[PDB]
Structures are given as structure tokens and as C-alpha cells.
Design a binder for this molecule. Structure first.
Ligand code: NA
Lengths: 68, 67
């Protein structure tokens, strides 16, 4: 659309501890496709959708998809 | 900064009525640099920073930058 999107410009280079993550948002339609993890520290973290740990957290039955 | 940004993926293709817009945001460090207009209904519209009308609108002291 002509409406702005939430998009990532860089990927996080480390693994977020699972215990710190409370949800995720999809930002896959951007120039750099990303998954954004929402944390207990009230931070939003851009990550590589293709990385193994990211796909593990996405598949976690207790982690909700949140809107952007 | 691994924090998300607000970015535009395409530009609106018409000229917005000035009466409709109430502020603007800058999204120039994106793959497609844009000026985002905010409407009185709090909708956001992506536009080309280089269009003459866009620059004239944002130069208006009564149309503020909203970060
Ligand atoms: Na202005």
C-alpha cells in the first residue's frame, strides 16, 4: 500500500535468550525481510528470518504473533 | 541499531489535498526514501521527497515535523 511499513535495516548478530522474548511481528515485505522479536525489556529486535533459532522461536507453541 | 524503522515501499501516486494533512514524518534512511504525511484522521501517506508539492507542503510553518 501507500501506507508506511515497519521495516528492519539490519539483523541482530546474536541469539536472544528465549526467556526474554514475549512475542514476534512479521516484517517480511520490506527490502530486508525480518522477524521482529518483542522482549520483556520492552525492546523490538530485528532478526534474520532464515536463521535456525529464529525459526525455532516462531514455531514455539507459546509465543504469539503480534501485529506491526 | 537493530531496532525496526518506519519505511515506505511505494509512493502515493496523486497530490494530497493540503487541507487533509496535519503533519509529516521523515523516512529518508530507507531503501525507498520518503516523506510520510499524517492526515487529520491519523492516516499515513508515503510520498516522494523530491516532488515539488511535497517540499512546498512541508516548508509550511503550520505543517510540523512529527518524528
Ligand atoms: Na513545516
Amino acid at each position: 500500500v501507500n501506507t508506511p511499513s515497519t521495516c528492519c535495516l539490519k539483523y541482530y548478530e546474536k541469539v536472544l535468550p528465549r526467556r526474554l522474548v514475549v512475542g514476534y511481528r512479521k516484517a517480511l515485505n520490506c527490502h530486508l525481510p525480518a522477524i521482529i522479536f518483542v522482549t520483556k525489556r520492552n525492546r523490538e529486535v530485528c532478526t534474520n528470518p532464515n536463521d535456525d533459532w529464529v525459526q525455532e522461536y516462531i514455531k514455539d507453541p507459546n509465543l504469539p504473533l503480534l501485529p506491526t
